Amino acid sequence: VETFAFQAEIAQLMSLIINTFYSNKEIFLRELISNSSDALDKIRYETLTDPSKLDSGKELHINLIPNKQDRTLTIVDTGIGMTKADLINNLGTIAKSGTKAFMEALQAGADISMIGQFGVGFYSAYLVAEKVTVITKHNDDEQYAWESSAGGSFTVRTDTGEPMGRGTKVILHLKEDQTEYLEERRIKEIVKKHSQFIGYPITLFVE
Numbered sequence: 001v002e003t004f005a006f007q008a009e010i011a012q013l014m015s016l017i018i019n020t021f022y023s024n025k026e027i028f029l030r031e032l033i034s035n036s037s038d039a040l041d042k043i044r045y046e047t048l049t050d051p052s053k054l055d056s057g058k059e060l061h062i063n064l065i066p067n068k069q070d071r072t073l074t075i076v077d078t079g080i081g082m083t084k085a086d087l088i089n090n091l092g093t094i095a096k097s098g099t100k101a102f103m104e105a106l107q108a109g110a111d112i113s114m115i116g117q118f119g120v121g122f123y124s125a126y127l128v129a130e131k132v133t134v135i136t137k138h139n140d141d142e143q144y145a146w147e148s149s150a151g152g153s154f155t156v157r158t159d160t161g162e163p164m165g166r167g168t169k170v171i172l173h174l175k176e177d178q179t180e181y182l183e184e185r186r187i188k189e190i191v192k193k194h195s196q197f198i199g200y201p202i203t204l205f206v207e
């Protein structure tokens with residue numbers, strides 16, 4: 001198990017998110033589904049020039065799996081996935097995002113609301129989760145599990161668990177007061193309101 005520090009600005013962004021009373025928390029699901037769609041688009045385009053890219057799995061979809069017993073909501077996609085390097089760089093640093101302008105924008109006009117337009121939508125997961133685990137398999141690497149309960153650091157380790165072929169699974173370990181996101185009716189309404197036009201099947205697994 002390797003432990004890494006988040007880039008300073010990401011750590012600051014996470015604390016803000018972690019501690020906010022921002023009301024419209026449901027946007028977290030929109031952001032994760034939008035990230036999954038992007039990942040699926042990526043593997044799908046690459047497969048136009050090289051069909052063998054789908055040897056790890058031909059299905060392109062997104063599944064939502066609430067688990068009331070474990071208090072987890074899991075978002076699984078079969079997109080392009082992430083290499084170890086991608087995990088460390090993309091979830092650990094500002095990378096390609098507009099993080100700095102977002103951090104500045106506490107004086108522009110928008111609050112916590114425009115996160116997704118600044119390329120940092122992923123972190124909205126911390127509005128509802130005390131901890132996030134990301135399990136991922138990219139065609140070019142082994143399967144890895146990234147995890148963080150914020151606080152400034154994250155871990156990365158080889159994942160020997162159930163093989164996924166290719167894709168990314170985000171497991172949200174929900175805060176005790178955010179269990180509404182495990183309710184079928186709530187999940188349905190959020191998908192309909194924010195993600196209805198996503199170009200891949202989004203399937204809710206009923207408990």
Ligand SMILES: O=c1[nH]c2ccccc2n1-c1ccc(O)cc1O
Binds near residue numbers: 038079082136167170
């Ligand atoms: O695993 C991934 N590879 C990607 C490539 C491009 C965009 C998003 C990508 N993702 C990705 C990132 C965050 C998620 O919540 C889900 C994902 O599938």
